Each structure stands twice: as C-alpha cells, then as structure tokens.
C-alpha cells in the first residue's frame, strides 16, 4: 500500500509553534531528513553543514547522484538569513507518493537565526510557486518537478493538528467532514486569497474589505500566527478585549510577547469570542466563512517549568506585509491546495477544535450584493 492515501495519513510531526515537518530523503544512498512543510515559500533548502541547532544535515559528498549547479544563493529575511549553493539530487518522501524525482536543492552552508532550536527539522520544503523562488523564478520548485516527472496529480492537502497529514496528489475524504468550500487562488506566487468579511463573535468589523487584504492575504503553513494588517489587527484586538473584559491582560500579552497562564484545566475559553473570516467564493459575491475558536488563537506553550498551569501566547499579531493565515488558522481544518484548478479548499478537519459549546466550522454560502483585492 506504498503511496496510498492511507499510507500518507499521519506523516507529519511538530506543532504550530515550531513548524510541522515531513520525513524526506535526498541523495544516494538516501539521507533521511525532517523538512518543514512551508506553503509560504518556494525553495527546497536543506542544512548542508553542521550547526548548533541541527541534529543532522545533508552531506553532498556522500551522494553520488548530487549535481552542482555552480550557482550561489543568498536569502535574507526580516528575521535571520541563509546562504548556500544550488545543485540537484534525487528526492523522495518515504511516507508520501511512491516515487523518486530529481529536484533542485539549495545546500545551506551558512545561516543566521534561521534554524529553530528543538524544532527537530533540518530543512524547508517550499510549496508555493516559482515566482517567489530564490534567486529567481527560473529555479523550479519541488512540487513542479514532482508533477512534471511523475503521474502525481497537481494538488496536495494539509491536515494540521495540535502531527497531521500531508496528502499529495489527492483528497482523503477520511480526513474531513461536511463540505469542502473553495476560495480562488488570486495569483500564483504565494498561495494568495481574498478575505471579504471579518466578524468577531458575529459582529462585523465593518471595514472596507480591501483593508483585510492590504497588501495581500496568503495561506502559509510556515507561519505560526494569524497575522493581520495593522488597521485590522487593532480592530480585532479592541473587539477581543471587549469580549473578554471580565479579565484584563498585560499589553504584552496582546503584543504576543507574553504568556497568560491559568491553573491547569481552568482556561476560561468561554470569555474569548470566535473569529470568522469570510473568504471569496468561486462565484461572484458568494463567500463562505471559516470560524476560529480561542483554542486556536491562544497557542499553548508547553514548558515543564510552568506545568502546574496551562499557559498561552496570543497567536494573532500585526503585519506590515498583508494578512497571513498561518498554522493556528489551518489547524482543525482540512486545507486542499488544488493547484490544478487554482483554488484552495477548506473543510472541517477530523482533528478540529471544539468544546461542548462551540466548534470550528466551515459554512456557506453567504451572498453580498466591490472588489476586495489590492493591486
Ligand atoms: C507553523 C510554523 C512554523 C515555523 C516556526 N518557526 C519557524 C519557521 C520558519 C523558519 C525559517 C523560515 C521560515 C519562512 C521562510 C522561508 C520564508 N518564514 C516564513 C514566514 C515562512 N512561511 N517560511 C519559517 C516556521
């Protein structure tokens, strides 16, 4: 049953805080590495040299199928950077499709604040499109090579839990309930989508819908938080604060830089509101909503030291580069990256979040008798 969806189920480990990752092999003989599943980037980039935070790394000299491309790559981010060398080599996913492809690989030789202590992965699998690949869009991303070189359908789905499942090439109906609702992929670079309405405990934020997508909105498995443009973030917070006003938290909580803790088992979920993000539908002015519980946007921080308590970071934070629907949004949903039809599907996940009062949900259609996208 190698490569059956059944065999791909449960192939991810990790958590929203440090990343979800899938086992991969590179080279011949195969070198086993854990790799971040990242829909917010487009390079297959792997530690290729010793580093304090790396338990293992890619050793190209030991791979006889490695091919050097004689091209450097330097990738700086807001937070930290990496530098490396491009080449190609044979790549497979042991708990993924039953196939081996030749793929681009950036062998990371130096990096600053890129690898994460105790995340247990050694590289990143950028699943977004070539337009954002480094050094440029001519470096073919992994998934494109996979589809090109095999009979794998041009679609993958992610079921993140809090490991989860990355199903390549198809939809595993055992991983969701109810209906699958699709939002268009606006442009093939990041997985760009359009948010048309935002409610907090059913109260509309009442902003021009372009504000929700200033200057883009993306679906990013490589981002922990729900990240919101400043104007939207401020309104969300004001609204969540109002909803939970029976308890006050330091401003550092709201800034995401400080835990809030309750005695084990006593988190007052009921004082936090639900968040509804309405996503553009596949037909004009029809939309559907995905609803997010505090169990999602309050990210638990596991720490033996604080373990008499349950502690959390606020996992909604401010962005100056557009909305990011990160891991805490994707968790408890089954998310279908249907590249073939240029759409992203959402359905309630088998591992969704709920208590006895409320539950994560995917609901539609909603009709609204304006273009919500930015240029
Ligand atoms: C879920 C999760 C997670 C997670 C936790 N810590 C670190 C990372 C992490 C570590 C290194 C880089 C990145 C990266 C970068 C390639 C562009 N940056 C971004 C916003 C993204 N989508 N991928 C993320 C991910």
UniProtKB/Swiss-Prot annotation:
The Gene Ontology biological process terms listed for this entry are: amyloid fibril formation; amyloid precursor protein catabolic process; amyloid-beta formation; amyloid-beta metabolic process; cellular response to amyloid-beta; cellular response to copper ion; cellular response to manganese ion; detection of mechanical stimulus involved in sensory perception of pain
Question: Hey, which stretches end up on the Extracellular side?
Answer: 1-374
The record lists the catalysed reaction(s) as: Broad endopeptidase specificity. Cleaves Glu-Val-Asn-Leu-|-Asp-Ala-Glu-Phe in the Swedish variant of Alzheimer's amyloid precursor protein
Q: How is it modified after translation?
A: N-Glycosylated. Addition of a bisecting N-acetylglucosamine by MGAT3 blocks lysosomal targeting, further degradation and is required for maintaining stability under stress conditions. Acetylated in the endoplasmic reticulum at Lys-71, Lys-206, Lys-210, Lys-216, Lys-230, Lys-231 and Lys-238. Acetylation by NAT8 and NAT8B is transient and deacetylation probably occurs in the Golgi. Acetylation regulates the maturation, the transport to the plasma membrane, the stability and the expression of the protein.
Highest taxon, organism lineage: Eukaryota
* Any single Gene Ontology cellular-component annotation: hippocampal mossy fiber to CA3 synapse
Q: Which residues are glycosylated?
A: 98, 117, 285
Where N6-acetyllysine occurs along the chain? 71, 206, 210, 216, 230-231, 238
**Membrane topology label:** Single-pass type I membrane protein
Q: Which cysteines are joined by disulfide bonds?
A: 161-351, 209-372, 261-311
Q: Which residues form the Peptidase A1 domain?
A: 20-347
Q: Where in the cell is it found?
A: Cell membrane; Golgi apparatus, trans-Golgi network; Endoplasmic reticulum; Endosome
List of catalytic residues: 38, 220
Single GO MF descriptor: enzyme binding
- Summarize the protein's role: Responsible for the proteolytic processing of the amyloid precursor protein (APP). Cleaves at the N-terminus of the A-beta peptide sequence, between residues 671 and 672 of APP, leads to the generation and extracellular release of beta-cleaved soluble APP, and a corresponding cell-associated C-terminal fragment which is later released by gamma-secretase. Cleaves CHL1.
Recorded family membership: Belongs to the peptidase A1 family.
Share the domain note from the entry. Answer: DXXLL motif is required for a proper endocytosis and retrograde transport to the trans-Golgi network, as well as for regulation of lysosomal degradation. The transmembrane domain is necessary for its activity. It determines its late Golgi localization and access to its substrate, APP.
The annotated subunit structure for this chain is: Monomer. Interacts with RTN1; RTN2; RTN3 and RTN4; the interaction leads to inhibition of amyloid precursor protein processing. Interacts with SNX6. Interacts with PCSK9. Interacts with NAT8 and NAT8B. Interacts with BIN1. Interacts (via extracellular domain) with ADAM10 (via extracellular domain). Interacts with SORL1; this interaction may affect binding with APP and hence reduce APP cleavage. Interacts with NRDC AND NRG1.
Q: What is this protein called?
A: Beta-secretase 1
Which source organism does the UniProt entry give?
Homo sapiens
């Amino acid at each position: 049953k190698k490569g059956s969806f059944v065999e791909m189920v449960d192939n991810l480990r990790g958590k929203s805080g440090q990343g979800y990752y899938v086992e991969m092999t590179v080279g011949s003989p195969p070198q086993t590495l854990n790799i971040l599943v990242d829909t917010g980037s487009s390079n297959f980039a792997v530690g290729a040299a010793p580093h304090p935070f790396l338990h293992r790394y890619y050793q190209r000299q030991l791979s006889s199928t490695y091919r050097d491309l004689r091209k450097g790559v330097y990738v700086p981010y807001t937070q930290g950077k990496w530098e490396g060398e491009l080449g190609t080599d044979l790549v497979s996913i042991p708990h993924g499709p039953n196939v081996t492809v030749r793929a681009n690989i950036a062998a990371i030789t130096e990096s600053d604040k890129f690898f994460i202590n105790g995340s247990n992965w050694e590289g990143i699998l950028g699943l977004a499109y070539a337009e954002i690949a480094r050094p440029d869009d001519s470096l073919e991303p992994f998934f494109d090579s996979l589809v090109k070189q095999t009979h794998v359908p041009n679609l993958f789905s992610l079921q993140l839990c809090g490991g989860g499942s990355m199903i390549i090439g198809g939809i595993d109906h055992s991983l969701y309930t109810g209906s699958l609702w699709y939002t268009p992929i606006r442009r093939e670079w990041y997985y760009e989508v359009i948010i048309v309405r935002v409610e907090i405990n059913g109260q509309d934020l009442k902003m021009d819908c372009k504000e929700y997508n200033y200057d883009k909105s993306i679906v990013d498995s490589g981002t922990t938080n729900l990240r919101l443009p400043k104007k939207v973030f401020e309104a969300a917070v004001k609204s969540i604060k109002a909803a939970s006003s029976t308890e006050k938290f330091p401003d550092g909580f709201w800034l995401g830089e400080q835990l809030v803790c309750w005695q084990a088992g006593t988190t007052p979920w009921n004082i936090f509101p639900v968040i509804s993000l309405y996503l553009m539908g596949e037909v004009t002015n029809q939309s559907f909503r995905i609803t997010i519980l505090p169990q999602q946007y309050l990210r638990p921080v596991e720490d033996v030291a604080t373990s008499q308590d349950d502690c959390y970071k606020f996992a909604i934070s401010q962005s100056s580069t557009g909305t990011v629907m990160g891991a805490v949004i994707m968790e408890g949903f089954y998310v279908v990256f249907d590249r073939a039809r240029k759409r992203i599907g959402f359905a309630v996940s088998a591992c969704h979040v709920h208590d006895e009062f409320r539950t994560a949900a995917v609901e539609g259609p909603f009709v609204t008798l304006e273009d919500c996208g930015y240029n």
